[PDB]
């Protein structure tokens, strides 16, 4: 029906063409008779008849008079729905400016006229005269004149100049300008000018003028002259069943506008004085501005009960606006809501449904089936039969929902698993019965949770929910690929109890012929479930060709494991169930079954596991009693000795031997050690303290205690919870965050006094408040993430790109946080993988790396793999399947048409609840055994032969004997080395040492040191030491340096026996070590030193959800680390007064880089060092924009991914890097031109990267030289707002500004996206509908 949406401003003539009449009276509806007045806000003649095919006068009241108008009253006999489309118009007495185009920063009118917004505000509201005709006088074209100035000019010059007031003057100024000559002059000035801010202003004005001239709109249309009026049905007067009507705010605002316009017309008809006319015009302008957008300027119009009125713009933007309340989401029919309970008998694809609730939901289907069966002949009869609830109605209900899936959804839909398709099973009751296994997917607890149900009502929706959103098809989390359907609480405990071995259980030592005999013995009560026996069992192994071979053998196991072996499928080996079978063991068994057997047996295995676990947990009868939590006998001795130690420390402090801070720290450490000892003793007394009398003697075995069984199996609780159960509660934190000296030494089994409870309440209150105020932040973050990547779908297969990320396992300190296996599995390679040292193709160029390939690459001890990434996907308007990788939810590669962006956004946003918002070295240690490598190192030998590095970015790698990088550390510059490179070392040894408090100056040459180019009292001072008293030189900074000595920069020169400065070996100029501020030198004049000696001494939360938000929004670190833009030497220029000027002087290239550095900011580099591109110059965090500009897209992508992964791993949540890579790619979507080239893009233009790439490719194909572009990193909010499709930006937020931009520029929006297609109401271009869309695209090919 249509292909695109055109957005622009409306001309007054076409606005008049829109209207079917003119509203001239403020009356809306007469209260005596419910009929509108003539020319009113609800007039029938202007808009339409109030009743279908009925004249207002009543002369014609039948369908036969359709299409004709009446003469008694002048209304048309049509449908009432026409009142929802016809709009009115009001002819304003004087032109009024549009508030949207005037107040929305930047002011379009002010920027177009090139004048400050204050002058526009003054002239618009009748405060200062503005000139229109400059004439031959001294007055220019646009000049601001006050009343006195205007009178003086009028006296001086008569009619030579024209000056005016109000919006009429603005309209005259807009109409009296030429866009072509203005834009040509602006372009010429921009070419001639050189100021950067002037260049940017001229560029933006040129862009605005070009956009205006390109479209058919004209500037004078920006000042309203005819005011449109909404159709009456969109501002209805709902009856109040009390003789009154509820007038909407729009009706009140329209009444105000009409009254003010009528008053102004009457006043100007009477030839009112100038002051009164100006006041009336200002009042009309204020009323129009309030109606268009209330509250933008001055005071908002108050309501009846002292509230701001709802204007036209108020119902477009905001959460309650039409976009986010009735367009993105809407209420739907065939839906229900009810509480949820647990049904253990249900299958994985089945859910319970109440009979009455299903009858209400499936009413039309029952009506249709009843009509087909002949029971009822009309809708009324079927409705009566349904409401009477006959047996035939229930039979029809059973028939119609045999295989009709229903969508079950929960209120906090974080990820796609929150809504799933289930087959309904009719039950008698009032609560929906949910499958226990899917609860973890729903994150729902049967503690009052309410869930909603929707009924798909077409073949496409039914089949698509059966095939895609069914619970059986959703077993792997799209976020990380880990299984979701796993036993959680009762099944795990039941299986752990079942697969547990005693020592002297009944029936131990017997021999059984198979699992059937074991089951029949257990049911008969002839042998205990924990008895250790030997059973002859046959297990099936999957052959290489794809067959099952049965091997029979005798295994020493338990009766419970033999019973469990029944439900295990043939392919799985017996070793999985021959253990304690904890929760992780069950999860591993399920994952192995899914990998080997597939999907069809996996659901059956899960159902059987759940049934067996529930049944045997019921049979076991595990219970919690007051005797279960045992109090250690040694606890009171530990408490007494800790108290005695604390008392003796306190009495020592009373003597003054130890200060308050040290004694506080010692007390805290002692209490922590005592708590750890008590917890360890309790755990030892609880784990294996069960002494069982085996035949002959006693023996120690794992305890069958209910608490220990229930916690060790992983069903519920953890080590800390058990520690709170039996051990002391430990130390607690006060509201500020510090630790309290006296901990809680009372268990939960024993009583707690008032003081301990009051102390402990702080943490609980803080956690509850944090969760309550963190839910909103998580929701906002996930909304922004979803919007940012709502238009990224796979629409290709292979770009042919040979560029990829240099993926390696992450090393941080002395541990391997994440190896290569998890960070590479389910991804494709960017190029061929070469075996280390053989140059052999281990992996082909474009082969997906599954488990087998991962094992093959890990067996060769490879660490560096180049893998294709989404950020490197060359495909425009989407990404390719190969450049993305594995689907992460299915075993195959991701299919075309999938919405990867929404998947990524939901995966990143789901752990928002788990995060937190609370705000609260001198040597290198070796842990493992391996050789040491050094990177980015320039080291020299010291006096004693030790090695000292002269590089600031030196990195040491501890690599095992297999060539794999095990550990990595960043050694500070100028650190002494105990051992050299390439020497194997053992754990616990120290290789490098340095002083963190202050840094010593390193000398790379050997010779004498003299006191040169510095004078005491001008540049340095010969200060006496506080203790030693030696005359040490201290360098004075520029602030205290004398004027005469300003040019005498201190610099120590190493000299030989001759006395002249020794040149650096292999370097022309001599070694002149610069002296920075606060430099302390101890050696005296003419001191002999060697290479590597120490010359001078120089002295020297962000986590959780806020950290993620700062990383995503590209927030400035507030203390950026200065980076070297170009590679070259460093020099110091003029000091100016507040900031030092540093000059970068490349050896070969020019020296255009001069950078201002704050004086108080520490400088890592001295005067005589060599640095490369992207080198750290000052301490602090690195801004993402600087990283992108200097080190490239790959480096900033890696930094963001690493930071996000570290933040998530700190909280214990694992997320694949594909989602972060997709988000980062969505971040980098804008490019700014540098060289115009043959393209038509402006020098300062910032446009889409895809458009630049397409233009460059077209120019290269033609043969002309392309343009040069630089990628820009814009925050997620800015990136989402600055998009081609203005509909998505308008729906997001800041609707006024984006709508104004779209109206001014005359943008044309093709849908080509998900959110806009959803808003319009068509099939989305993602998933199934994508295919259809593709067909449509080919139909546009011809």
């Amino acid at each position: 029906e249509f292909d695109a949406i055109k957005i622009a401003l409306a001309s007054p003539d076409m606005i008049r063409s829109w209207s079917f009449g003119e509203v001239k009276k403020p009356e809306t509806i007469n209260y005596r008779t419910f009929k509108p007045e003539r020319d009113g806000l609800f007039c029938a003649r202007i808009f339409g008849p109030v009743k279908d095919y009925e004249c207002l006068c009543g002369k014609y009241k039948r369908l036969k008079h359709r299409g004709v108008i009446c003469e008694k009253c002048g209304v048309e006999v049509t449908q009432t729905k026409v009142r929802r489309e016809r709009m009115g118009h009001i002819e304003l007495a004087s032109p009024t400016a549009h508030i949207w185009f005037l107040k929305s920063l930047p002011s379009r009118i002010g920027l177009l006229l090139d004048m400050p917004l204050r002058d526009i505000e003054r002239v618009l509201y009748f405060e200062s005269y503005v000139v229109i005709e400059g004439g031959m006088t001294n007055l220019e074209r646009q000049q601001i004149l006050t009343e006195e100035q205007y009178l003086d000019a009028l006296e001086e010059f008569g009619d030579e100049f024209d000056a005016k007031m109000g919006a009429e003057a603005i309209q005259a100024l807009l109409k009296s300008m030429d866009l072509e000559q203005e834009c040509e002059q602006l372009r010429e000035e921009l070419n001639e000018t050189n100021s950067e801010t002037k260049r940017k202003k001229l560029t933006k004005r040129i862009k605005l003028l070009e956009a205006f001239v390109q479209s058919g709109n004209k500037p004078e249309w920006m000042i309203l002259t005819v005011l449109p009026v909404l159709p009456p049905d969109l501002r209805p007067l709902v009856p109040l069943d009390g003789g009154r009507f509820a007038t909407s705010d729009l009706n009140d605002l329209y009444r105000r506008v009409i009254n003010r316009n009528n008053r102004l017309k009457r006043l100007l008809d009477l030839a009112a004085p100038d002051i009164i006319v100006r006041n009336e015009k200002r009042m009309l302008q204020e009323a129009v501005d309030a109606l268009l957008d209330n509250g933008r300027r001055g005071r908002a119009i108050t309501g009846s009960n002292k509230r701001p009125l709802k204007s036209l713009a108020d119902m477009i933007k905001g959460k309650q606006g039409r976009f986010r309340q009735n367009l993105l989401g809407k209420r739907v029919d065939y839906s229900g809501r009810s509480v949820i309970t647990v049904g253990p008998y249900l299958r994985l694809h089945q859910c319970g449904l109440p009979k009455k609730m299903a009858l209400e939901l499936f009413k039309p289907f029952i009506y249709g089936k009843l009509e087909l069966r002949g029971l009822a002949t009309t809708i009324k009869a079927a409705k009566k039969m349904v409401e009477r609830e006959e047996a035939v109605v229930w039979d029809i209900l059973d028939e119609v929902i045999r295989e009709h899936p229903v969508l079950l959804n929960r209120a906090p839909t974080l990820h796609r698993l929150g809504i799933q398709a289930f087959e309904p099973v009719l039950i008698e009751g009032k609560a929906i019965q949910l499958h226990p296994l899917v609860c973890a997917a729903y994150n729902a607890d049967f503690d009052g949770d309410q869930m909603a149900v929707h009924v798909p009502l077409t073949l496409e929706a039914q089949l698509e929910a059966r095939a895609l959103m069914m619970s059986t098809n959703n077993i792997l989390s799209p976020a990380n690929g880990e299984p979701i359907i796993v036993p959680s609480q009762d099944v795990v405990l039941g299986l752990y109890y079942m697969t547990r071995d005693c020592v002297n259980a009944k029936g131990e030592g017997m021999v059984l012929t198979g699992p059937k005999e074991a089951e029949r013995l257990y049911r008969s009560g002839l042998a205990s479930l924990h008895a250790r026996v030997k059973v002859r069992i046959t297990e099936y192994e999957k052959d290489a060709n794809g067959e099952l071979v049965a091997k029979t053998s005798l295994k020493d196991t338990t009766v419970g494991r033999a019973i469990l072996w029944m439900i295990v499928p043939k392919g799985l080996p017996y070793s999985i169930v021959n253990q304690a079978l904890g929760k992780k063991a069950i999860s591993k068994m399920l994952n192995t079954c899914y990998r080997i057997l597939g999907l069809k047996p996996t659901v059956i295995f899960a159902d059987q596991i759940m049934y067996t676990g529930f049944a045997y947990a019921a049979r076991s009868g595990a219970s919690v009693g007051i005797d279960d939590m045992v109090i250690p006998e040694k606890k009171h001795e530990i408490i007494s000795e800790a108290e005695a130690e604390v008392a003796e420390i306190q009495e020592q402090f009373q003597s003054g031997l130890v200060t308050a801070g040290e004694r506080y720290n010692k007390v805290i450490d002692i209490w922590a050690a005592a708590n750890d000892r008590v917890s360890k003793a309790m755990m030892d007394n609880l784990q294996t303290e069960t002494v069982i009398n085996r035949d002959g003697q006693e023996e120690k075995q794992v305890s069958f205690n209910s608490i220990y069984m229930m916690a060790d199996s992983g069903a519920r609780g953890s080590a800390a919870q058990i520690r709170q159960l039996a051990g002391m509660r430990g130390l607690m934190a006060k509201p500020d965050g510090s630790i309290i000296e006296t901990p809680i030494t009372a268990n939960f089994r024993e009583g707690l006094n008032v003081l301990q409870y009051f102390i402990s309440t702080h943490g609980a209150r803080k956690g509850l408040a944090d969760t309550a105020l963190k839910t909103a932040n998580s929701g906002y973050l996930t909304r922004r993430l979803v919007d940012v990547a709502q238009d990224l779908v796979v629409t290709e297969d292979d770009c042919g790109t040979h560029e990829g990320i240099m993926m390696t396992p992450v090393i941080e300190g002395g541990d391997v946080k994440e190896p290569l296996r998890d960070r590479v599995l389910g991804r494709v390679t960017a190029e061929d993988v070469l075996k280390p040292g053989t140059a052999d193709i281990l992996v082909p160029r474009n082969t997906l790396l599954h488990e087998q390939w991962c094992d093959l690459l890990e067996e060769n001890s490879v660490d560096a793999v180049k893998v294709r990434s989404v950020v490197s996907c060359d495909t425009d308007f989407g990404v390719c399947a190969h450049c993305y990788g594995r689907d992460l939810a299915r075993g195959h590669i991701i299919n075309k048409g999938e919405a990867i962006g929404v998947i990524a956004a939901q995966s990143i946003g789901e752990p928002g609840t788990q995060l937190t918002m609370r705000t609260f070295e001198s040597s290198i240690q070796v842990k493992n055994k391996g050789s040491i490598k050094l990177s980015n190192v320039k080291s020299v030998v010291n006096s004693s032969g030790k090695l000292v590095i002269t590089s600031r970015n030196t990195e040491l790698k501890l690599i095992d004997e297999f060539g794999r990088t095990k550990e990595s550390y960043k050694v500070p510059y100028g650190a002494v080395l105990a051992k050299g490179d390439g020497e194997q070392v053992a754990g616990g040894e120290t290789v490098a040492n340095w002083d963190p408090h202050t840094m010593p100056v390193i000398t790379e040459v050997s010779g004498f040191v003299r006191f040169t180019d510095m004078i005491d009292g001008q540049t340095i001072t010969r200060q006496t030491d506080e203790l030693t008293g030696l005359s040490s030189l201290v360098v004075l900074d520029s602030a205290e340096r004398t004027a005469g000595g300003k040019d005498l920069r201190p610099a120590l020169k190493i000299v030989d026996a001759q006395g002249n400065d020794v040149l650096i070996p292999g370097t022309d100029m001599p070694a002149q070590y610069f002296l920075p501020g606060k430099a302390i030198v101890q050696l005296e004049d003419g001191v002999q030193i060697s290479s590597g000696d120490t010359l001078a001494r120089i002295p020297q939360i962000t986590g959780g959800l806020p950290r993620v938000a700062d990383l995503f929004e590209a927030r400035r670190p507030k203390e950026p680390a200065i980076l070297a833009e170009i590679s070259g030497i460093v020099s110091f220029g003029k000091e100016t007064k507040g900031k030092r000027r540093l000059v970068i002087t490349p050896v070969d290239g020019s020296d255009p880089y001069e950078e201002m550095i704050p004086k108080w900011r520490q400088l890592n580099v001295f005067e005589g060092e060599r640095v490369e591109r992207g080198d750290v110059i000052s301490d602090g965090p690195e801004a993402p924009h600087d990283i992108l500009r200097l080190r490239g897209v790959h480096a900033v992508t890696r930094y963001i991914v690493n930071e996000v992964q570290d933040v998530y791993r700190l909280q214990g949540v694992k997320i694949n890097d594909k989602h972060i890579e997709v988000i980062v790619r969505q971040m980098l979507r804008k490019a700014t031109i540098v060289n115009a080239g043959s393209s038509d893009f402006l020098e300062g233009e910032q446009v889409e990267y895809s458009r630049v790439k397409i233009a460059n490719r077209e120019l290269e194909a033609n043969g002309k030289v392309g343009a040069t572009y630089s990628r820009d990193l814009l925050g997620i909010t800015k990136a989402s707002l600055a998009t081609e499709s203005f509909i998505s930006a308008a729906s997001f937020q800041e609707t006024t500004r984006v709508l104004t931009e779209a109206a001014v520029a005359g943008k044309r929006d093709e849908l080509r996206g998900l959110k806009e297609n959803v808003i319009v109401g068509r099939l989305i271009p993602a998933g199934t509908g994508y295919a259809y869309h593709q067909d449509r695209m080919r139909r546009r090919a011809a």
Partner: protein, 99 residues
């Protein structure tokens, strides 16, 4: 609370809300995002137009279901028409370009 069909809003032509008003459950933005995550296109489209706003679509769906035919006419949601009318009343032209 369960609803198959009932009274609709007189301004947005959408089902009412609340049990006391015999309304329908709200399909929020997160539900739409989850549907798009599954690749749900036909289900989302039928939940967006033929169930809530498209009056002609709703009537056609009811007649087809009574007749035993499961087919959907997307039509045109009335919320978008309302939004277009409000934007037009703001003095800003918006229209659907057929070409």
């Amino acid at each position: 609370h369960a609803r198959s069909t009932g009274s609709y809003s007189l301004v947005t032509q959408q089902p009412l809300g609340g049990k006391a008003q015999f309304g329908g459950q709200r399909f929020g933005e997160m539900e739409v995002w989850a549907l798009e995550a599954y690749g749900a296109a036909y289900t989302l489209q039928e939940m967006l137009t033929v169930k809530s706003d498209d009056v002609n679509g709703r009537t056609k769906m009811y007649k087809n279901i009574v007749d035993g035919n499961h087919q959907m006419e997307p039509g045109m949601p009335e919320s978008f028409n309302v939004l277009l009318k409000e934007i037009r009343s703001l003095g800003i032209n918006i229209e659907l370009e057929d070409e």
